[PDB]
Amino acid sequence: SQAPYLSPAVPFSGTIQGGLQDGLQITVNGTVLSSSGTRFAVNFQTGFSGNDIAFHFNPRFEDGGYVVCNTRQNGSWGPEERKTHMPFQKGMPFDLCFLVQSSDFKVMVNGILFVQYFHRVPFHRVDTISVNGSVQLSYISFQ
Numbered sequence: 261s262q263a264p265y266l267s268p269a270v271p272f273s274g275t276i277q278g279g280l281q282d283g284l285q286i287t288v289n290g291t292v293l294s295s296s297g298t299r300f301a302v303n304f305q306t307g308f309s310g311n312d313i314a315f316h317f318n319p320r321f322e323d324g325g326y327v328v329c330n331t332r333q334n335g336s337w338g339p340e341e342r343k344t345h346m347p348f349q350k351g352m353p354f355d356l357c358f359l360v361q362s363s364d365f366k367v368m369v370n371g372i373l374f375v376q377y378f379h380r381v382p383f384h385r386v387d388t389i390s391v392n393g394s395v396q397l398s399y400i401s402f403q
């Protein structure tokens with residue numbers, strides 16, 4: 261899109277207008293819930309079902325804190341990329357930004373490069389962003 265989605269309720273699912281295109285920046289601005297309450301996810305997916313998630317970005321406040329990055333294809337999860345030293349904390353606001361590049365998603369958190377996730381499926385087929393889990397959202401916006 262862009263009008264942004266303002267104060268969207270979680271779980272959230274919404275259209276990305278024109279789908280993912282090279283150069284598109286998707287901001288997810290919100291706060292990790294203080295409750296107990298150990299994971300949240302941002303999914304760049306095709307349609308409503310969640311069977312085809314080009315990029316599942318999944319902070320887990322477990323086993324020291326880590327982020328799982330993965331792709332689901334016709335209902336099947338791939339091999340996980342896991343990143344430690346995660347820049348999310350329970351009760352802490354965040355500005356999470358996804359940049360679509362030709363080769364990857366570049367993910368910035370609070371203005372700092374966090375992870376790159378190389379495309380496993382074509383990114384243009386992504387037409388929907390969904391967010392679920394232990395998070396509240398101030399806005400999701402698009403540049």
Ligand SMILES: OC[C@H]1O[C@@H](O[C@H]2[C@H](O)[C@@H](O)[C@@H](O)O[C@@H]2CO)[C@H](O)[C@@H](O)[C@H]1O
Pocket residue numbers: 316318328330337340
């Ligand atoms: O890979 C993303 C999905 O992970 C699923 O859980 C994994 C788990 O991370 C891994 O340790 C292994 O044991 O298998 C599971 C795959 O079913 C979550 O259930 C799912 O929500 C995604 O996060």
